[PDB]
């Protein structure tokens, strides 16, 4: 039903970071987890998705090598890891309900992202 | 192989897990999430490949037009028996290439226990297999995840080999 | 694959219609595009799954349309809180999903 | 120290046939036939339909007095007639190209009545108010069409009419008008001055000479004369003129319109419901998004295509043989 | 001791194509293409069909001399004409809606013919014996049609015509008749009184005022004048009326018949035998449950489609690999 | 699995017994009938899901309706080219899937046999396979049954062992 | 000491979609879908088609003056009508049968225009040399078509006229004609003496009677009266015969022609070249062997089935996995 | 058979040998021109099954024949739905049986391999074998065209199976 992201912090560059995303109100592992980042201004850009129930990932390729995602289906928590931030990384990220796993998808709703979270509001500077 | 299992919660390929240490049935994740993609895509191409028009079908004729009016009850029972055949055989090619694909996944499943093991367990024949060396439950999650190498226990085989 | 939102309702007075409109780059099918909305300060929320179809919690006044590349969001009345940022989400072959520009609704 | 291999196994009862194979129970299936339908009709594109319900839409059309009561929509996505359609022409005759009619009226885009020759001053020179019949009477009030007028005769003088329309709008206007064929001479003589008379109509598009045809007829309803009806698009700019001697039914109301993509009309007597629906179907709406229905292939819009077989379904499990 | 498995070989040559090979030999197959045919007519779903080996639809449904000694049948499910069948219309004409008749009688269920107006007593004021053409004649006796009369001036006058039918038969009617057009005003005189000529016919549904065509024509079967033929369907409890002052051709016969599906007309010279068919191909009728035949496009009944290939069959057996 | 057997009439699948106590063909009578049921299924499916209504083919126009002759000969042109094309396909495509499927059978029987002889005989690779150990009539009936009692032959192995 | 098992790879881009899935990279493919044309118009079957350019089928075949530039061939492959094709009929008229004229037209394999009445000697007591009309010009002054002529009162009388064409050629004789109906009584008693008037055509089997049909219309192209036409087909061995007292345009020339009614008619801008193809499109003429196309769903010859698809691309090469 | 050879002239399988008197790839003649072979007969029955008859598709009607245009427009909507659905679908269908056919044929190779170095090579499983004898020139190329003759070498891998 809800994501609840965890608190904000300020980095300063080439550090790594540990975002956190909890879900509940419904099954866990039906369902994939997406990251989006919202620089401000812009608009949505998409930073990844990470499978719930399989482990499988999918990285933005100009961003390839720098988006790590791990999922702990014990505590339903799941975590990203960002390395080498720049100052134009600045951004708030909203944690997202993707695909779901496990069956045979017909409709046109899972496709998409319904439940989104609060945002982290990441600072880099 | 031989059948099917009732005791899987949640996957549709699996191992069953005997052990000292525990028990159960645990699914295999990445061969079940790959299949279940390309039966989705295989369902949603079958259906969204459709090309529907907005049209209108049914039309009303004279008296005096029988002759088109039988034609036009030709074109619709010629697009039915096309529509019908069609679609019958394509539900059921559809349906036995994906239950054969779907066989086809769970011998390959054998396959990549089978070539993994390189004769460091004893094949049963009824799609099982029993290990002739001790097995924890590590290395049952190293032959699930694909990543167990025979070397490791491989003398130990070799004497209950022997044993035999 | 990329879209191009093309905004045409920069500026306009609640109560009339919003002809908003997004082009995709390529034909795609239109079960894999939906439309979000975004109040400033608050996260975002889905409004259409699909082209075709809406099946949320929200108000009738949302119904979109579109087809291949063409497709069309149309926000029949609009009301103090409709003015918020729309985005574009397309799905690709992959599990990778991309978005639009997006476009204001000033007051 | 044992593993197997093999696959789901569930209760689930779906059977599905294949080529090898019938019968087979799948853990797992998909439906492709859709044989469900609302039981109710709606509004195909979320645009009402225009019904009828008894009234037929010739009936409608002319201003059939039974059904003046049918409210008019500025647009159309399909018709809707009951099977027990009635109440069409009202006095006894036949439309020429009826169907022509019927189908480019199927889907309108833009559709407005106005009244083309206002009854009080087009027709000075000729009696407007004895154009009745028995036929069809209103409440028994012995009444005619509400969209035609009749003219007779006016102190035994029948001056030649020469009206026209210009048509200054921007829409294509249908025209619709009728030529009343008299049971004996008789009666051609005490209803019309000039025994011996014609009624010409005609646009750029247009041209068509008609003739009196007096004979005694078999009886349809009480009367043995009998009425023909013509109609005519009206391009934009396009004068339309009514020359006659003869007996010429004048419209009094005409149409605007703007054809629609072309629809078709449904006869049902399911009643009409107030939703929105992607398809229509004579036994309600349809809102499937699956390949293939069973429902009656006379469908309006864009829709599964129909197939006779009883079930379509694809598997997406595996076999389910519990063991 | 060696054991082997292996497959089976057989003298059989059949050979099947396959997507990636051509010429495979096989063990057993069968065939979904029907290559051959009986080379016979015959009866479709029981009733035999209607064979008219010199006469044409409109020779037989008038009633040309030559077309007396063909069988009338109660039912048919189709009508066989022969490639030199052309002994039809016998005065110089055309029928109008030929084509609509032609097809409607494909398939009647119960047909029988009837006297609709006595030769004898409908027709005390005019002279039924005459109406000679003299283009059509049998064993030179210059006989008309059977089926219809042609009525002439009794002498001096033609008393106007004013016939009416009840149709009291429970199914649809079918009544013919023609309007003759002489050549000349002089021939009109001589044929007919009163050169301006009035002819009316109609029922509840159908109404038509025909007037005659008076001019030099080419000469055709010697007659340089031409004949228009007519049908109209009468409903059951409907009324039928002729009205005219000359040159109408009056039906004496006309048919009952209750039409019940739909089919078609073989153009053939295959004889007719008894058989029991389910589909009936102008080359001769088929014995098959097979998908398909190559024999003709035009079948009528539940026959294979038709596939404009050699051979569709698939392989049953195994690969013939010879030892 | 190379040619065919030119002496078996008995079925379409089978098993070559060449011993000093007797020699012949036989069919594998269960494999043979479950090939047959299915391709009969297979055959009546072809056949009997093609819908069939009561029509009529071919309609007379005059010489003022050539426009409306040439719909209708459009109409059964496309027709004839859609039954054509797809008949041609349907027969092509379905005749490689029925010899596929007769040698992945006749394979499955290798298979079988290889999995019931386990290391009790060699295998040639062109479809036989030579036993090391004297099996009497009965005994080879037990292997084409599928209960060959393994355990009780070793011990000849064990002697066979020295030879190889 | 060691060997791998592999298959080759390639630097390929093509994109190939599969089942189940899609965007699948293959070192080989073969595209069945032509999304290719030249641009240009082309011959079919070896033979030229007739280009109109600027004039309508009614323009040509009527002998507009305007067409004067265009001259004929012997053997058509289709006809090519452009979107600027205005200069059609020059008199206000609706020309009947007008699209089977066209379907008729389509492809002739030997076509000739005859001089069917020359003008010298075949109207001796009507007046050929007026007639022409403000709505047909020609270099500044009113002209008139060249294939038809309009006859006129010729010294204050209109003589019957009674003509007739004996078919002594091998092939078919397209013969056309027209009816003039002046806009007043006045104007028909200037121009025709005989006031009432009739127009008889026939043949052995065409024979039709027309009458004008005076009325005040609607002015189209400066005039108010109009024109019917008609064309009739004449077979070997038969005859076409004019009778008329007045209002007949008669033709002076008319076509034989061997026709081929295999080909269509093609609406398209693009100008004609040299080349051989089996199929013409709008867009431009293709050549090709593969079964489908998305060019246009209007065709005429050999080509493929119109498909909406952007891509058929069928593999033939495996699945390339560069390692 | 893990990735392809970007190094190959031609052929769409081959080998490739690592050797003290070279190294390189090199096509299978004899499976690469039967798989041409088939494919090209593939491609050719789908452009040879289709033999479309000369028409002229496109008919004009007149104003007053609404409902004929209306019912020449079903029927080419009609044949364009036939047409697009069924040649989406033979393509999709076709390009799947292409790419398992051609996985197919180079696990045929590979186990044809298996039978003449069945117990002559370390098989490792990633489309590699790696031979426990001193193998020249001459038996690679035997074993590339064929007819491998197994007892040649036999004891010499056995002690090279000793040390292993
Ligand atoms: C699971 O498999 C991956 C494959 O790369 C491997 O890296 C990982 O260590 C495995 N996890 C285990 C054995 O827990
Ligand atoms: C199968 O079992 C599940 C258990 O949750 C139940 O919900 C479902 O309805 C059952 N299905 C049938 C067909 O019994
Ligand atoms: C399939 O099973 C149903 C019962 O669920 C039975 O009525 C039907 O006849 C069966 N069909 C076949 C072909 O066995
Ligand atoms: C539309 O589809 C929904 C399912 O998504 C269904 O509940 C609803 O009843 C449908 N409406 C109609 C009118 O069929
Ligand atoms: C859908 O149906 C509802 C019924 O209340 C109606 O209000 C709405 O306007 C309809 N949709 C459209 C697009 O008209
Ligand atoms: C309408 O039709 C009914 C059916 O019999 C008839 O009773 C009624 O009088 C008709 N009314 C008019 C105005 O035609
Ligand atoms: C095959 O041999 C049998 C004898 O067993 C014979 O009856 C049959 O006709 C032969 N068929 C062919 C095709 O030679
Ligand atoms: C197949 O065999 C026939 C003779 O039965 C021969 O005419 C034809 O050319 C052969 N085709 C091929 C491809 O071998
Ligand atoms: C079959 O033949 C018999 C012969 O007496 C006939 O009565 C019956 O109606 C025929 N049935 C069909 C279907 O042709
Ligand atoms: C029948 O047709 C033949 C054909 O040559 C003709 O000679 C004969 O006069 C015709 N007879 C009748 C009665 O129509
Ligand atoms: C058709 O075949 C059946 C045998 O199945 C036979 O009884 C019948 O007489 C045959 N009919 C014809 C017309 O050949
Ligand atoms: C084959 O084995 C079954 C048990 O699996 C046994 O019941 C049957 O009798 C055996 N048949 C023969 C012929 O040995
Ligand atoms: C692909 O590689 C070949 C190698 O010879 C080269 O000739 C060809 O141009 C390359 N293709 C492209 C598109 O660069
Ligand atoms: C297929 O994937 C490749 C991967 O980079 C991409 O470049 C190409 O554009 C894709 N093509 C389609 C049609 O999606
Ligand atoms: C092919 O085109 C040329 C013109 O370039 C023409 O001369 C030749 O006759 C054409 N071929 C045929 C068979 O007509
Ligand atoms: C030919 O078309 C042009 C179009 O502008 C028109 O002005 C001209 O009058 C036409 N010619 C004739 C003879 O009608
Ligand atoms: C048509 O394509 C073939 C394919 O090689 C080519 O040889 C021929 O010249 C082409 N003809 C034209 C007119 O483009």
């Known amino acids: ?125 | ?164 | ?107 | 120290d044992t593993l197997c291999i093999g696959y789901h196994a569930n209760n689930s009862t779906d059977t599905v046939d294949t080529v090898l194979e019938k019968n087979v129970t799948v853990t797992h299936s998909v439906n492709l036939l859709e044989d469900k339908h609302n039981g109710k009709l709606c509004k195909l594109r979320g645009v009402a339909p225009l019904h009828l319900g008894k009234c037929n839409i010739a009936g409608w059309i002319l201003g059939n007095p039974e059904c003046e009561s049918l409210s008019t929509a500025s647009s159309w996505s399909y018709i809707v007639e009951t099977s027990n359609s009635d109440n069409g022409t009202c006095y006894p005759g036949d439309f020429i190209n009826y169907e022509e009619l019927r189908e480019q009226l199927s889907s309108v885009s833009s559709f407005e009545r106005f009244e083309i020759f206002p009854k009080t001053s087009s027709w000075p020179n000729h009696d407007s108010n004895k154009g009745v019949t028995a036929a069809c009477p209103h409440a028994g009030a012995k009444s005619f069409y509400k969209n035609l007028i009749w003219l007779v005769k006016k102190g035994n003088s029948y001056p030649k009419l020469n009206q026209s329309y210009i048509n200054d709008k921007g829409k294509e206007v249908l025209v619709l008008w009728g030529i009343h064929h008299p049971s004996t001479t008789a009666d051609q003589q005490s209803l019309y001055q000039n025994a011996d008379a014609y009624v010409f109509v005609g646009t750029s598009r247009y041209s068509k000479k008609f003739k009196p045809e007096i004979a005694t007829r078999p009886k349809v309803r009480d009367q043995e004369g009998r009425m023909n009806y013509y109609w005519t698009l009206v391009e934009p700019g396009d004068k339309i003129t009514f020359e006659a001697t003869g007996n010429l039914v004048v419209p009094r109301y005409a149409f605007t319109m703007e054809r629609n993509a072309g629809s078709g009309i449904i006869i049902s007597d399911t009643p009409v419901h107030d939703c929105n629906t992607t398809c229509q179907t004579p036994e309600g709406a349809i809102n499937t998004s699956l390949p293939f229905q069973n429902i009656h292939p006379i469908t309006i819009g864009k829709c599964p295509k129909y197939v006779k077989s009883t079930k379509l379904r694809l598997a997406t499990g595996l076999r389910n043989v519990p063991s």
């Open chain 2, 1 to 164: 192989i031989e059948g099917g299992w009732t005791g899987m919660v949640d996957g549709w390929y699996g191992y069953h897990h005997q052990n000292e240490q525990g028990s159960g049935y645990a699914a295999d994740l990445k061969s079940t999430q790959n299949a279940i993609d390309k039966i989705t895509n295989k369902v949603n191409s079958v259906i969204e490949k459709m090309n529907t028009q907005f049209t209108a079908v049914g039309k009303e004729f004279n008296h005096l037009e029988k002759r088109i009016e039988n034609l036009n009850k030709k074109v619709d029972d010629g697009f039915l028996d096309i529509w019908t055949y069609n679609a019958e055989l394509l539900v059921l090619l559809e349906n036995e290439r994906t239950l054969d694909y779907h066989d086809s996944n769970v011998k390959n499943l054998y396959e990549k226990v089978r070539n993994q093991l390189k004769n460091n367990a004893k094949e049963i024949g009824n799609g099982c297999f029993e290990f002739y060396h001790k097995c924890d439950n590590t290395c049952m999650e190293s032959v699930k995840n694909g990543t167990y190498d025979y070397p490791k226990y491989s003398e130990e085989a070799k004497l209950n080999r022997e044993k035999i």
């Open chain 3, 1 to 107: 694959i990329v879209l191009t939102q093309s905004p045409g309702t920069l500026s306009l007075s609640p109560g009339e219609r919003a002809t908003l409109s997004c082009r995709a780059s390529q034909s795609v099918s239109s079960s894999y595009l939906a439309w979000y909305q975004q109040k400033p300060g608050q996260a975002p929320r889905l409004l259409i799954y699909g082209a075709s179809s809406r099946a949320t919690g929200i108000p009738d006044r949302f119904s979109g349309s579109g087809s291949g590349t063409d497709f069309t969001l149309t926000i029949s009345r609009l009301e103090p809180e409709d003015f918020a940022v729309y985005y574009c989400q397309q799905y690709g072959s992959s599990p990778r999903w991309t978005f639009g520009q997006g476009t204001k609704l000033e007051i």
């Open chain 1, 1 to 125: 039903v809800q994501l609840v992201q965890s608190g904000a912090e300020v980095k300063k560059p080439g550090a790594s970071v540990k975002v956190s995303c909890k879900a509940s109100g419904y099954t866990f592992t039906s369902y994939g987890i997406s990251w989006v980042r919202q620089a401000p201004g812009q608009g949505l850009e998409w930073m990844g998705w990470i499978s719930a129930y399989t482990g499988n990932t999918n990285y933005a390729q100009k961003l390839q090598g720098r988006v790590t995602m791990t999922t702990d289906t014990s505590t339903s928590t799941a975590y990203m890891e960002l390395r080498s931030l720049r100052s134009d990384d600045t951004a708030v990220y909203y944690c997202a309900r993707g695909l779901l796993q496990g069956v045979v998808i017909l409709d046109s709703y899972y496709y998409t992202m319904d439940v989104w979270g609060q945002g982290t509001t990441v600072t880099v500077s």
